[PDB]
Every structure is written in structure tokens, then in C-alpha cells.
């Protein structure tokens, strides 16, 4: 129909792109928080593996 409708659609897509750009960084931060919570449980797993091993032997 005309240039007005296309102009509104380019503005519509530009708004969504800025929040999806922010959410990638927000996700990277949360990924780093879940990776330290992964390392704070290894000691309870590696030592009990040894105890259950010797106790069976």
C-alpha cells in the first residue's frame, strides 16, 4: 500500500532486536553463575565415591 506501513514495521523489528541483544549478555552472566554452582558440589561427590569404594572392599 505505501511507505508508512513499511516505516512502522522497521521500527517494530528494531525494538525487539535491542532486547534480544541484552538477553544474550544476561544469559552469559547467568551461565557463569551456574558454572560456579557446578564446582561447589564436586568435593562431596569425589570423596563419597572413595568412602563407598573402601567400605565395600
Amino acid at each position: 500500500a505505501g511507505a508508512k506501513e513499511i516505516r512502522s514495521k522497521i521500527a517494530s523489528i528494531k525494538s525487539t532486536q535491542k532486547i534480544t541483544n541484552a538477553m544474550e549478555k544476561v544469559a552469559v552472566s547467568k551461565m557463569r553463575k551456574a558454572q560456579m554452582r557446578m564446582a561447589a558440589g564436586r568435593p562431596y561427590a569425589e570423596r563419597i565415591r572413595q568412602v563407598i569404594g573402601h567400605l565395600a572392599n
Binding site: 558440589g41 568435593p43 562431596y44 561427590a45 563419597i48
Partner: protein
């Protein structure tokens, strides 16, 4: 003189480093561990462990766990909540409660692989 001691739970550590003496509420009488103790594994009771450190003193409350002792090292596999049978059973029944559904089926349902393959190709086009 000084024995290495670590208080550890499934979610995170609670304490670490060298200590002079460790006092713990075991299953059958209290224990006093000092450097060089003989190998001992013991079930703990809900209560505090006192750690004497070269003279200062530390205290931490624990809800259960396993005390592993060696001459060189002392490991405390500390639990994060009370493991009482009523609590233990309650959370299992809540899982069964939610698990219940209107279409349980026979248990031999299959061939849904086509749907997962159709979506996998769309996911390739997306990236």
C-alpha cells in the same frame, strides 16, 4: 600438630584449612579427633561440630552427615536438611501427586521420532 579439616555439603563447602582438634556428635558417643588419628568412618547426629584451631575456636551447626577420619586429613560430609522418614516420604508422594495424569497409556507408545526430526531440520534453518 595440625590436621587438615574440610566441612563439605552437596551444594557448597562450609569450612576448610588446618586445625588442632575436632569434636563431633557421632552415632554412638562423642569423638575427639587430633592429628594422626586411626582410620574411622562415622554417622553423625543433628548438632554442632567444634573445631579447635592452634590455641582460636570455631563452631558450626550441622543437620546430619558422615565423618571420615584419617591421620593426615578429616572430611565432614555434611547434610543440608533433616532426613527423617516422614519428610523423606512426603516429598516422594508430592512427586507422585504431580506425576498423575489423565492419559497414562500402556507403556509401549513409540514412533514419535518423526516429530523430533521435523523440528531438528527447522532448528538448522533458524541458525
Amino acid at each position: 600438630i595440625t590436621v587438615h579439616c574440610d566441612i563439605v555439603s552437596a551444594e557448597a563447602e562450609i569450612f576448610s584449612g588446618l586445625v588442632e582438634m575436632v569434636i563431633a556428635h557421632g552415632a554412638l558417643g562423642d569423638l575427639g579427633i587430633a592429628p594422626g588419628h586411626a582410620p574411622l568412618i562415622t554417622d553423625l547426629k543433628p548438632g554442632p561440630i567444634r573445631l579447635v584451631k592452634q590455641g582460636e575456636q570455631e563452631v558450626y551447626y550441622i543437620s546430619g552427615g558422615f565423618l571420615e577420619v584419617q591421620p593426615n586429613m578429616v572430611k565432614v560430609l555434611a547434610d543440608t536438611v533433616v532426613r527423617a522418614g516422614d519428610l523423606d516420604e512426603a516429598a516422594a508422594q508430592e512427586a507422585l501427586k504431580a506425576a498423575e495424569k489423565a492419559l497414562q497409556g500402556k507403556g509401549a507408545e513409540f514412533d514419535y521420532s518423526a516429530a523430533a526430526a521435523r523440528l531438528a531440520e527447522a532448528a538448522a534453518q533458524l541458525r
